[model samples]
Target chain A: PYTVVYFPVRGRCAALRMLLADQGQSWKEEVVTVETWQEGSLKASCLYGQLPKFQDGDLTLYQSNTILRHLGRTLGLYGKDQQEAALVDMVNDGVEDLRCKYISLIYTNYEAGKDDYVKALPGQLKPFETLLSQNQGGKTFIVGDQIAFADYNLLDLLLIHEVLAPGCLDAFPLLSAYVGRLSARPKLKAFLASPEYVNLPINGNGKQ
Target chain B: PYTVVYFPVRGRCAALRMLLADQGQSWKEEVVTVETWQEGSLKASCLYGQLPKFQDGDLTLYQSNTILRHLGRTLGLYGKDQQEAALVDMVNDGVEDLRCKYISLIYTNYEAGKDDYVKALPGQLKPFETLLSQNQGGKTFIVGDQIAFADYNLLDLLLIHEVLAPGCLDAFPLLSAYVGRLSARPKLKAFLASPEYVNLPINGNGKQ
Candidate 1:
C-alpha cells in the first residue's frame, strides 16, 4: 500500500500522481489544507518540512523526485539498462530545472514576469524539443520506446506549460505530438479529466 | 577517461568532484569561461543550455544530480540494497532542495534575504542531522557503513553552509561532527585543501 501526503494543489505531486494513475497503481492521499498547514504540527513532523511525503509499506519517503524514482524503480519504469536509467534521470532532472523556473514565476513574480517568461519560453523549451528531435525523430519515448518516468515528468511539464502559455507547443512539433500521445493513454486520459484532478488548482497560488 | 564540462566555480559540480576525488577516479575538467559562454555557440549546442555537463566514454550526461547518481551507480556508491538506494536518494534530494534555496539566496536576493535565510538555517539543517542520528548513532555514513554518493553531496552542503553562516551546525551535534568526520577523509581532505577547489568561487556570481 502506498500513501502520499501533500497539499490540495498538484504542485510537485502531479507527475507522481500521473505515473501512479497511468500505471494503475493504487495509492492513498492525505491532503493537507491551508488551515492544517498553518497549524504547523504536521509540517513540524515532516523530516524535510515539505510534502508529497510518501509511505511505501514501512518505508516513509520525502522529496517528490525521490518518490517518483522509488515508484519508477519498483514498477520497472526506470529504464531497460543502467545507461538508459542515466538517460531517464537526465531527462527528469531537466524537467525539474524547468519546473523550478515555472514555480518561481508562478509564486514570486507572476504579475510582472509572466510576459517576459512566456516570451523566453521557446529558448527554455528548445532543449527538450531538441532532445526529441535527436531521439528517433521524437516518434518514441524520451529515452527509448518503452516509457520511462521521465516521460511522465516531461508530459506533465508540457501540460502545465501549455496552460501557463497557450500554444507554447505549436512551434515544437515533437513535444506537441509527444503530449498528444501520452495524454491519450486511456488511464492517464481518464485520470486527467476526472474530478479528482480537475477540481484542484495546478498551483497553490492562482497564477496557473 | 571521463570529462566534466563546467564553469570554474564549484556550483553544481562540487559533490561530483568530491565523489571522484575520494574514489580516486580519473576525470578531466573542461572549464567554460564567461567569455566562451558569451560566444553563444557552445551554450546553443548544449541540450539544456547549462553547465556541469559530463561525458563518460561514448555517453554524455547533464544535470548535476543526474551526474552524481550516474557516478554512484557506476561506482559502488549507490547503496547495498533497494531500500538503501531509495534512502540514499531521499538524502540526496533533501540536500539538493536545500542547495537550491542556498543558490536562490546567494544569487537572487542575497542582501535582503541572507539574514532570514541564515536564521532559518537550523530547521533546514535538522532533517539531515536527524537522519544521521537515526543511523548508527550518527557514526559511519549517511546511509550505511559504506559511503553513498549522498554522503558526498551532504558533506559538500554542510561545508558550504558553514561558510554562508558560521556555526550553523553547532545546534546539531551529529551534523557538526559528521561534517568534521567526512572532511577528515584523506583524499577528500586533500581535495578540499587543494587550490583546485579552494581557489574557485562557490557560485558563478562569486557569492557564498
Candidate 2:
C-alpha cells in the first residue's frame, strides 16, 4: 500500500521503479513538482531536500537507499541470509557513492567554478570497471546471479553515466554491454518509454 | 553477534554505535588510521570507493544511513509502523546532511576555506532545536516518550562536533545543554569513557 512520489524524472527515482518491476509489485508513483515539493508534506518527505519518497497511504517514507533495501527485504529480493542481505546493502551503498559524485558534477555544473570533474570521472570509472569485471562477467548477474534488484540497479546506474557523459563507459566494455542488455529487458524497456523513466532532464545540470 | 568495523570518528558509524548503545549492546570500535584507510578496505568496499563500511562479523554492510535505519528496526528503535519509522528516518537523514556539511568544513579544512561554517552551523542548529522542541519536548526522548536510538544518535553526533571542533555549539544553546545532559547520564557517562567510545580523527584526515 506504499505510494512512491517524486518528480516525473528518473533523477533519483528510477531504482525504486526497477526494483518494483523486478518484483512484479505495484505501487502508486506520484510526481510532485518543485513548487509542490517546497510547500507540501512532500518537502518533509525528502529529509535532505533530495527526492523520490515512498508513502504508504497517510505514512510517508524517505531515503531512497532505505526504501530500496526495505522493499527488497519485504519482497524477498534481498537475500537468504543476513550476510547475503548485507552484501546487497554494501553494493548499493557503493553505487550511491558514485551516483552522489556524478550528481554533484552535473548539479554543480561540473563545478563550473573550475571543479576537476572531467578528470575525476575517469579515475572513478576505472575502479568500477574492475568491480563489474570481478563481480559480473556479463555472463552472470551481480551477487549470487539470481538477478536481484541490484543487478537491474547496476544497469540503471551505468545507463545514467552513459546518458550524462557518453564516453564515460568507453573504457569499461563489460559494464557498457551489461547496461545495453539491461535496457533491453522487457519491463525496463517498457519503463524506458514511459514518462517515469524517459522524462528525466538527462542529467543533473539540466534538472538541478 | 555483529562486529561493526569502521574508522574511529563518529562520521558514518556513529549511528550504528548509537543503535547498539540503545539496546545496551556491546561492539568493538576499530580505529583505522588515515594512512591505512587511504589504501585499505576503504577503497575495497565500494562499487565506488568510500569509507564507513559495517562488518557484522564476516558480513559487511555499507551506506551508513541505511545501516542505521536497518539496525533501528532490528533494535526496536524505529517504530513498528513503516510510515512512522520513515519519519524517524527522515529526521536522521536530515541530521546526516547537516553532519556531512559540518564534517567537510571542519575536518577537510572547509573551515579554513570558508569562515562562514561557524556562523552557518547556527542556522542548521535552529532546525534541530525546532525538531526536538516540537517533536520531543514533551516526551522523554526523540521518537515517542521512551529513549529511541535517535536520541542516543543525536547525542553522539553533537558530541563529535563539540570534541573535534570547538565553538561549534556557541549558537545553539538548547543543543549545547542537551548534549551535556545526555552525556552526563550515568550509564552514558560510563559508556562514553569506555574504550568503545574513543574519538579519532574526523574522516581520517589526521593522525596516521
Candidate 3:
C-alpha cells in the first residue's frame, strides 16, 4: 500500500492518481488543507518543502517525479529495456519542463500571463506531436507498444492544457487522438469520471 | 564514445561531464555557438528547443537529466538496488528543483532577486544536509556507500552555489564535508582543475 500526501487540488498528483487507478493499486490520500499549509507546520516538515510526499511501506520519498518513477518501477510501468527506459525518462522530463511553465502561469501570473502563454501554446505543444509522429505513426504508446509512466504524465499534461486553452489540441491531430485514446482506457476512464477527480479545481487558486 | 551538444556554458552539463570524467569515459563536446542559435536553424531541429543534447553510439537523447540517468545506467552509477535507485531519484529531483530556481535567478532576475534568493538559501540547502546526516553520517555518498549519479549532480550544485554565495555551506557541516569528500576523488579532482571545466561560465548570460 502507498500513501500520497498532497493538496486537494489536482495540481501535480493528477497523473500519479491516474496511474494508480489504471494499475488498480490501492493507495491512500492525505490531503493537505490550505489552513494547515498556511500554519507552516506541514510545509516546514516536508523534505523539500513541497507536497505529494509518498510513503511506501516504511520508506518515505519526496519529489513528485521520484514517486512516479518509484511506482513505475514497482508496477513494471517503466519501459522494457535500458534504451526504452531512457526514452521514457526523456519523455517524462519533457512533460515536466512544460508542466513547470504551466505551473508558473497558473499560480504565479495567471491573469496577466494567460494570453501570452496560450498564444505560444502551439509551439510549446508541437514537440510532443512530433514525438508521436516519429513513433509508429503515432499509433501505439509514446515509447513502445506497452504503456509507460510518461504516457500518464503526458496525458495529464494534454488534459490540463486543454482545460487551460480549449481546443489547444485541435492543431495537432495526433495529440488530439492520443488524448482521446488514453482517456478511454477502462480504469482510467472510470477515474476520470469519478467525483474525486472532477470536483476539485485544477489548481489551488481556483483557476483552470 | 559520446557527444554532448550544448551552448558554451557549464549550466546543465557540469554534472554529467563530471560523471564522464570521473569514470574515465572519453566523450566529445559539440558546442553550439550563439551565432548558430541566433540563426534559428538549429533551435527548430532541437526536440524541445533546449540544449544539452547527448549522443551515445547511434542514439541521440535530449533533456539533461535524461542524459545523466542514461549515463548513470550505462556506467553502473545508478544504484545497487531498486530502493537505492528510488532514493537517488529523490535526491536528483531535489537538486533539480533548486537548480531551476538558481537558473531563473541567474538568467531572469539576478540583479534584483539575488539578495532575497541568497537570503533564503539556507532553507533550500538544508534538505541535502539532512539527507547527508541520515546516511552514514555524511561519510558515504548521498544515497549509499557507492557514488550514485545524484552525488555527482548534488556535488555540482553545491560547488556552483558556493561560488554564487560564498560560505553558504558553512552552516551545514555535513554538506560542507560531503562537498569536500566528493571533490577529492582523484579523477574528479583533476577534472575540476582542468581548463575544460574551469574556463566555462556557469550560465549562458556570463554570470557566475
Candidate 4:
C-alpha cells in the first residue's frame, strides 16, 4: 500500500505519479489544499517542510526524488549493475538540477525569469541528449537496455518542459523521439490523458 | 584506483574528499584551474559540463552526490537496509537543498542576500536537529547507529555553514556536538587539519 500527500498541483510529484502509474501500482493521493496547509501542522511534520510525503506501508518518506529512488530500489527499476546504477544516479541528479530551475521560474519569477531560462534551455537539455546518444543510439532506455527510474523522472521533466515551451525538444532529434517513444507506452499514455492527471495545474500558480 | 577531476576549490567536492579520507581511501586529484577549464576541451566532454568528475577504476561518473552514492554502495556506507538507504537519501537531499542556497548566497548574492539567508537559517537548520532528536536523542549517526554516506554530506554542509556564520550551530546543541563527534574521527581529524584540506577556499568567489 502506498499513499502520497501533497498539494493539488502536478509539480514535483508528476514523475513519481507517472512512474507508479506506468508500473501498474495503485496509490492513494491525499490532496492538501492551500487552506489546509496554511492552518495545519502537516508542513512541520515533514522532514524538509515540504511534500510529496510518501507512505509505503508503515514507513513514511518525504521528498519526491527520494520516494522515486526508494520505489526504484524496491520495484527493480534501478538497473542491472552497480555501474549502470551510478549512471542512473548521474541522470537523476541532472534531472533534479533542471527541475529546480524550472520550479524557481514557475513559482517565483515566471515573466521575469522565463526569457533567460528559455535561452539557456538548450544547453541544459543537451547533456541528456548526449547521454542518450551514447546508449544504443537513444533507442534503448537512458542508461542500458532496461528502463531505469531516472528515465521516468527525465520523461516527466521533458514532458512538462514541452508544455512550458511547446517546441523545447525540437532541437534534439534523439530527445524528441525519446519523449514520443516513452509517452506512447500504454499505461503512461493513459495516465497522461486521464482526468486525474490532466485536471490539476502543472504548477500551483497556474504558470505551466 | 580513483581519480577526481575538479577545480582547486573545495566547493562541491569537500564532502566527497572527506568521505574518501575518513574511509582511508587514497585517490589522485587532477585539479582543473579556471584557465585550464577555459582553454581545454574538457568541459565539453563532461556530461553536464561541470566538474567533480570521479573515476573508480574504469567507471567514470559526474555529479558529486552520484559519486557519493556510488561510493556509498561500494563502500557499505549507505545504510543497513533499504529503509535506511531511503533515509540516507532524504538526508542527502536536504543537505543538497541547503548547499544550493548557500552557494547562491556565496557566489551570486553575497552582499545582498546574506542578511536574509542568515535570518532564515534557523528554520532551515532545525529539521536536521529534529531528525537527530528522533534517532537516539541525537547521539547516533544520522539515521542509525552506523555512519552513513549522508552523514558525511551533512557534516560538510554544517561545517561550511558554521564558517559562513560563525556561531550558526551554537543554538542547536545536538548538531553542535554531532559536528564535534564526527570531526573527531581519527582519519577525518587528520585530513581536516591538513593543508590540502584547509588551504582551498570554500567557494570559487573567495567567499565562504
Candidate 5:
C-alpha cells in the first residue's frame, strides 16, 4: 500500500489514481491546498521537492512517470512479452506527448495551440482508433486486445480532454467509443465513481 | 547485434557507447557529417527525427534516455532488482542535473549559475563518491560492487567534466580517482586510444 499526496485537481496525479483504481488496488490520496504547498509540509515532502509524491511504506519516490510505470508493471498492466512491453512503452510515451501538448497550450497561454490541438489531434486520433480497431481484431484492449495499462490509460486520457478540452474528440468516433468501452468496465467504472476519482487536475495546468 | 546510428560525438550517445563498450559488445557506430545531417538522413531517419536512434535487428528506437535504459536492462547493466535500478535512475538523474548546468554554460551562454554548480556540486559529489567508496558496505561499484551500468556511466559522466571544463574535477578527488580507475580498464584504454574515441564532439553543447 502507498500514500499519494497530490492536489485534488486530478491534473497531476489523476492518471496514477485511475491506474490503481482500474486495477482495483487500494491507495490513499491526500489532497493538499496550494496555499499549504507554498507555506507548509508539501514543499519539503518529496525527495526532489516536487509534488505528486508517493510514499510506499517508508520509501518516497518523486518522479510520477517512474511511479506510474512501477505500479503498472507490478500490477500486470504491461504486456506479455518484451516486444509487447516495448510497444506499451511507445504508446505510453505517445500519450505523454499528447498530454505535454495540452500542458503547453493551457499553461503557456497558447490558446492558438489549444485551438490547433483540437484541430490537429483528429489526424493523430484517427490512426490510433484505426490501430485499436484493427489490432482489437474484435477484442478489447489497445496493445493486445486485452485490458492492458494503455486501454485503461487511453480512457482516462480522453476523459481529461473531455473535461478540459471538451470537443477535442468530436471527429474521432471510434476513439470516442473506445473510451466508452474502457469506462464501461465494471471495475474501471467503479474505480472512477469512487471518491478517489473526483476533481482530478492535469498536473499543474496553468489553471491551478 | 544492434545497429546504432549517431554522431561519433558523445553528445547524447556517449551513454549508449559506454553501454556497448563496457560489455565488450561489438556494435556499429555510424558517423554522420554535419553536411549530411543538414542535407539528409539524420533528422529524417528516426521516429523523433533525432540522433542516438537504435535498431535492434528489425525493431527501432529513437529516444536516447529510453534507449539507454533499455540497453542497460538488456545488457544486465541496470541491476538485479527494481530498487537498485531506481537508484541507478536516481543517481543517473543527479548526474544529469549536474550535466544540465554544464549544458547551459556551454550552449545557452548562461554562466551566471556556474559558481552555483561549482559551489553545490562538491558537497553533492561527496555522497556519490561515498557511494563508490563505501561500495555498498564493502562493495566496489556504485550499485554494489559490480561493474554495473552506473559504474561505467559515472566514468563517462566524469569525462564530460574533464573535457568541458578541464579543472571541474579538482574538487572531487574521490570521483576523479574513480574515473581514473574506470579509465584504466585495459580494453577501455585501447578503445579510448582508438581514433573513434576522440572523435566525439565535446563542444557543441546542444545549440539549436
Candidate 6:
C-alpha cells in the first residue's frame, strides 16, 4: 500500500509523485486543506509537523527526501552501485540546497530578494551543469546511464525553474537537452501533462 | 587521502571529523578563519559559499551531507543493504531538518527565537524517540545493527543540543541512552573531549 498525505499543490510532492508515476507504481494521495494544514490532530500527527507524509505498507514516513530515498531504494532507482548511489545523493543534495533558497524566497522574501535571486540564478545553476559535464559526454542520465531517483528530483527542479524564469534553461545546453529527454519519457511525459498536474500551482505564492 | 576545508567552528565539520575518528581514519584539516572567508577570495571563489568542501583522493566534493554520504559509501558506512541505506538516509534527513532550524535560529534569530525553539524542543525530539521505539530493542545503532554515516551526524546534533539546553535529552530515554552509547566509543570519546574539538565554539554567534 502506497499513500501520500500532503497539501493540494504539487509543492513538495512533485518529485515524489513524478517518481511514482515514472516507475509505473500507483499511490493514494490524501490532500489536506491549507486551514486544516495548521489545525489540530492531523498536523500534530505528522512526525515533523509538516505535510508530505508518506506510507509504504507498514512504514509511515515524513520528510520529502526520505520518502523519495525509500521509494528509490525499494523501486530500484537509487543507482546501480554504491559509488553511483553516493553521486546520486550529491546531485539530490545540490538540488535541495537550491530548493531551500528558492523556498525561502517564495514564502518569505520574494519582494525583497527576487532580483538578487534571479541575477544569481546562473551561478546557482552552474554547479549542476558542471556535474553533468563530468559525466560521460553529459549525454546519459543525471548520474549514470540508469535513471536514479534524483533524476526525478532534478527534472522537477529544472521544470519549475523554467516556469519561474522563462528561457532559464537556454543558457545550459546540457541541462536543457537533459530536460527534454527526461520529460519525453513515456510515463513521466503523460503524467506531467495530465489534468491532475496542471491544476496544481507551481509555487505557494503568485510567482509562478 | 582526505582533506576538509571550512571555518574553524565545529558546526558542519564536527560530524565529519567525528565520523573519521570513529572509523579510525585520518585526514587533513585546513582551517579558514571568518576573516579569510570575508576578507579573502575564498568567498567569491566558492562555488556556493562553499566548504565543508572535501577532497577524497582525486575527487573534490562539497555539501556537508554529500561529503558524509561520499565517505559513508567509500568507507562502507552507508549501510549493509538498500533497506538499511534508505533508513540511514531517513535519519540523516531528519537530522538536517532540525539542523537547519537550529542554524537559522543561531544565525538569524537567536535572541528572539530561542525561547520558542526551546519550548518546542520536546515535540521536535519525540519523533526520534518514537522512531527508536519501533526498531529492534532500541539498543542497536540509529537505523540498524551496523553503524551508518547518519548516526555520526545525528550523534553530533544531539550532543550540540545537550550543550544548548543541558537537560534536554532527559525526556527521551532512547536518545539519551543512544548518546551515551555512541559517545562512549573509545576513539570518538577521546576525540570529543580533545582540545581540538573542545575548544571550538559550536555556533557562529558564540551562543554555545
Clashes of 6: 0
The DockQ score of candidate 6 comes to 0.58
Model 5 regions more than 4 Å off: A39-45, A94-105, A108-142, A145-158, A161-164, A170-177, A203-208, B32-45, B92-139, B150-158, B165-178, B203-208
Looking at model 4 chain B, which ten-residue stretch has the lowest summed lDDT? Answer: B39-48
Expressed as tens digits, the lDDT of each residue in B1-208 for candidate 3 is: 7999999889999999999999999999998999989998888888998887789998889998999999889888888989999999999999999998999999999999999999999999999999898898888899889998889999999999999999999999999989898899999999999999999988889886
Better of 1 and 5 by TM-score: 1
- State residue A162's C-alpha deviation in candidate 2, in Å: 0.6
Candidate with the larger lDDT of 1 and 3? 3
| lDDT-superior candidate, 4 or 5 | 4
- Which 10-residue window in model 3 chain A sums to the lowest lDDT? A44-53
Each candidate's clash count: 0, 0, 0, 0, 11, 0
Which regions of candidate 1 deviate over 4 angstroms?
A: none
lDDT of 6 by residue, B37-156 (tens): 778577665545677778887766778998898888889898888767767877888899999999888898888888899999987888788778777867988887889999899999
**Which candidate has the highest DockQ of all?**
4
* C-alpha RMSD values across all candidates: 1.6, 4.6, 1.0, 1.2, 4.3, 2.4
What is residue A129's positional error in candidate 6, in angstroms? 1.7
DockQ score for model 3 = 0.87
Pick out the ten consecutive residues of candidate 2 chain A with the lowest summed lDDT.
A110-119
Measured with C-alpha atoms, the lDDT of residue A163 in candidate 6 is 79
Q: How do the predictions measure up, each by TM-score? A: 0.96, 0.76, 0.98, 0.98, 0.78, 0.91
* Cα lDDT for residue A57, candidate 1: 99
lDDT of 2 by residue, A1-208 (tens): 7687777567667777887775667788677777786686756534454667676556555677667656665676776665555566556656777777777766666547224665676776665466457664655555665666566566778877666567778877877777777677787788778776666775534643
Q: Which regions of candidate 2 fall more than 4 Å away from where they truly are?
A: A1-5, A21-50, A111-119, A122-140, A145-153, A204-208, B1-10, B14-31, B35-54, B61-81, B112-115, B122-140, B144-152, B162-187, B195-208
Could you give the TM-score of chain B for each candidate, in order?
A: 0.98, 0.79, 0.98, 0.99, 0.82, 0.97
TM-score of candidate 6 chain A against the true chain A? 0.97
- lDDT of model 1 at residue A161? 91
